[PDB]
């Protein structure tokens, strides 16, 4: 709420991401999740820090702490903060591949911090959603689309060297960027994202990366078009959403899904009790898709939090989350340091 890039939007963004991670972690990897059972489960969140966060939040915190420490993007600082955060607490639920990147970055002889990510998966790079799950702080630090794209990509490339992974990080950072600007139609929001992704996916390196994996040309653009069709479709079922967009570990099977959850839930849903506000119903809906509920809800929550603001962050939900106060302090610090208030 309030003006574009207000303090409330910054606080709401990081709190929404934290809620998604902590509340979504209960259903992580559940093939199916019944909506009625989700509504039952958030009852427990009704009137501290009993819900632990996962690698989504741990990496998001390290990314933001690097930006605040250098008041800029600093590849060596950020890479080392990622690796040291893993070292301090390896059990947060990290992807199996990315741990190899952290161990290489922990070797002090490693003096080109982008090269471990490039060796992943026979030298093609990861397409997992880890670059996107943590990227929201980039859009808090940087106001222009140009800088958002540039540093979403660079921060993602520290672990995700495939364009299929870093273009998902860019897409997620662009969605947070737009949400921070305030009121929009769902169709205008989608159309702006589609325009940006069509520009990026025209690049020769993106086309090659997709072709080598057997995928369609312009995989994010294709899924954003599918979002537009789904938003106009009657009687959309969870099975249809998952079939067209995904609910998986790959960035292309989870970032468009998170954006769909945000856009769909801009409007009331008769299936979700009206006692829940817009941020709450976005998180409930995201978790009801099952699969990678932790990361899909974290990303949908970052977008919804930026759009709806801190007034929609329920205190009873927030105070259930490990580290909610540190998350809030980091949001306020980003607003002061970068937004220069
Ligand atoms: N090019 C590839 N070829 C084959 N498999 C791949 C490729 N890229 C990724 N994978 C598979 O994707 C896996 C993860 O890629 P990773 O880079 O390790 O980690 P993340 O940080 O993105 O974590 C992704 C989620 O996993 C957890 O839930 C986290 O919380 C994240 O939400 C690999 O182990 C491979 O099986
Ligand atoms: Mg996780």
Whose C-alpha lies nearest to ligand 1, atom 20?
130
CA distance 130 to 248: 12
Cα angle value 5/321/299 (rounded, 5°): 50
Q: How far is the CA of 180 from the centre of ligand 1 (A)?
A: 28
173 Cα distance to chain centroid: 8
Kindly report the number of other CB atoms within 10 A of residue 258's CB atom. Answer: 33
Q: How many angstroms separate the CA atoms of 1 and 91, rounded?
A: 36
Centroid of ligand 1 to alpha carbon of 127 (angstroms): 7
Is 160 within 8 Å of 125 (Cβ atoms)? yes
Pocket-testing residue among 126, 132, 167, 212, ligand 1, by greatest number of atoms within 8 A of Cβ: 126
Helix segments in 25-97, DSSP class H: 35-42, 55-70, 75-88
CA quadruple 316, 295, 161, 224: dihedral sign: negative
How many domains are there within the chain?
Answer: 1
Distance between CA atoms of residues 5 and 143, nearest Å: 8
Question: How far apart, in Å, are the Cα atoms of 22 and each of 93, 206, 297?
Answer: 12, 33, 9
Strands (E), 112-211: none
Separation of CA 132 from chain center:
5
Q: How far is CA 52 from CA 63, 143, 201, 321, in A?
A: 19, 31, 37, 6
Those residues whose C-beta lies under 8 Å from the C-beta of residue 63, and which sit 6 or more positions away, are: 78, 81, 82, 134, 135, 137, 138, 155
Resolution of this structure in Å: 1.6
Q: Which residues is 128 bridged to in the sheet?
A: 250
Q: How far apart are the first and last CA of the chain?
A: 16
Q: Which residues line ligand 1 (CB under 6 A)?
A: 54-56, 93, 95-98, 121, 124, 126-130, 133, 162, 249, 295
How much distance in Å is there from the Cα of 93 to the middle of ligand 2?
5
Instruction: Give helix 115-123 / helix 98-105 axis angle, nearest 10°.
Output: 140
Instruction: Please report the atom of ligand 1 found closest to the CA of residue 254.
Output: 32
Task: Enter the DSSP assignment of 31.
Answer: S
What is the domain range of residue 53? 1-341
Protein residue closest via CA to atom 26 of ligand 1? 95
| Residue to substitute in 53, 60, 95 for testing ligand 1 pocket (most ligand atoms within 8 angstroms of CB) | 95
For residue 244, give the CATH number of its domain: 1.10.4080.10
Determine contact, residues 272/285, Cβ cutoff 8 Å. Answer: yes
Q: Which phi and psi (to 5°) does residue 321 adopt? A: -95, 125
Mutation choice for ligand 1 from 63, 118, 128, CB with most ligand atoms inside 8 A? 128
CB neighbour list of residue 183: distance below 8 Å, 6 or more residues apart: none
Q: What is the longest distance spanned by two Cα atoms in the chain?
A: 58
Alpha carbons 86 and 120: distance in angstroms, whole number: 18
Question: How far is residue 280's CA from residue 304's CA, in Å, rounded to a whole number?
Answer: 9
CA distance 181 to 253: 26
Q: Which one-letter DSSP state was computed for residue 216?
A: P
Ligand nearest to the CA of 251: 1
| Shortest-distance Cα residue to atom 28 of ligand 1 | 95
Are 251 and 129 contacting, i.e. CB atoms less than 8 angstroms apart? yes
**Nearest by Cα to 132 from 114, 115, 157, 100:** 157
What angle in degrees, to the nearest 10, is found between the helix axes of 7-24 and 55-70?
A: 150
Which residues in the chain are immediately followed by a break of C to N over 2.5 Å? 47
Distance (Å, whole) CA 257 – CA 263: 10
Cα–Cα distance, 173 to 129 (Å, whole number) = 13
Q: How far is the CA of 54 from the centre of ligand 2 (A)?
A: 5
Task: Using alpha carbons, select from 154, 118, 113 the residue that is nearest to residue 134.
Answer: 154
Number of Cβ within 10 Å of residue 327's Cβ equals 24
Experimental method of this PDB entry: X-ray
152 in Cβ contact with 138 (< 8 Å): yes
Q: How far apart are CA 75 and CA 58, in angstroms?
A: 18
């Amino acid at each position: 709420a309030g003006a574009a890039r207000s303090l409330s939007r910054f606080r709401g963004c990081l709190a929404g991401a934290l809620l998604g991670d902590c509340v979504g972690s209960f259903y992580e990897a559940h093939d199916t999740v019944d909506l009625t059972s989700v509504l039952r489960h958030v009852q427990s969140l009704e009137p501290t820090e009993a819900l632990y966060y996962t690698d989504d939040t741990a990496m998001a915190r390290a990314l933001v702490q690097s930006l605040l420490a250098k008041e800029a993007f600093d590849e060596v600082d950020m890479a080392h903060r990622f690796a040291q955060e893993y070292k301090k607490d390896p059990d947060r639920g990290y992807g199996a591949g990315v741990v190899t990147v952290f161990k290489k970055l922990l070797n002090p002889k490693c003096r080109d911090v982008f090269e471990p990510a490039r060796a992943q998966f026979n030298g093609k790079g990861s397409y997992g959603n880890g670059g996107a799950m943590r990227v929201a702080g980039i859009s808090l630090a940087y106001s222009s689309v140009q800088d958002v794209q540039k540093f979403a990509r660079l921060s993602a490339q520290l672990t995700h060297a495939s364009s299929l992974g870093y273009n998902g990080a860019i897409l997620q950072a662009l969605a947070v960027h737009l949400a921070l600007q305030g009121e929009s139609s769902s169709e205008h929001f989608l159309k702006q994202l589609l325009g940006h992704m069509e520009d990026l996916e025209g690049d020769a390196q993106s086309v090659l990366d997709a072709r080598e994996l057997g995928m369609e040309e312009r995989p994010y653009s294709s899924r954003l078009k599918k979002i537009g069709e789904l938003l106009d479709q009657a009687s959309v079922t969870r099975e249809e959403v998952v079939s067209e967009l995904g609910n998986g570990i790959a960035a292309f099977e989870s970032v468009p899904t998170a954006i769909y959850c945000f856009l769909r839930c801009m409007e009331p849903d008769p299936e979700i009790p009206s006692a829940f506000n817009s941020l709450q119903r976005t998180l409930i809906y995201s978790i009801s898709l099952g699969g990678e509920t932790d990361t899909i809800a974290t990303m949908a929550g970052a977008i919804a939090g930026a759009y709806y603001g801190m007034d929609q962050v329920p205190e009873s939900w927030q105070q259930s989350c490990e580290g909610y106060e540190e998350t809030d302090i980091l949001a306020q610090s980003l607003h002061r340091v970068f937004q220069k208030s």
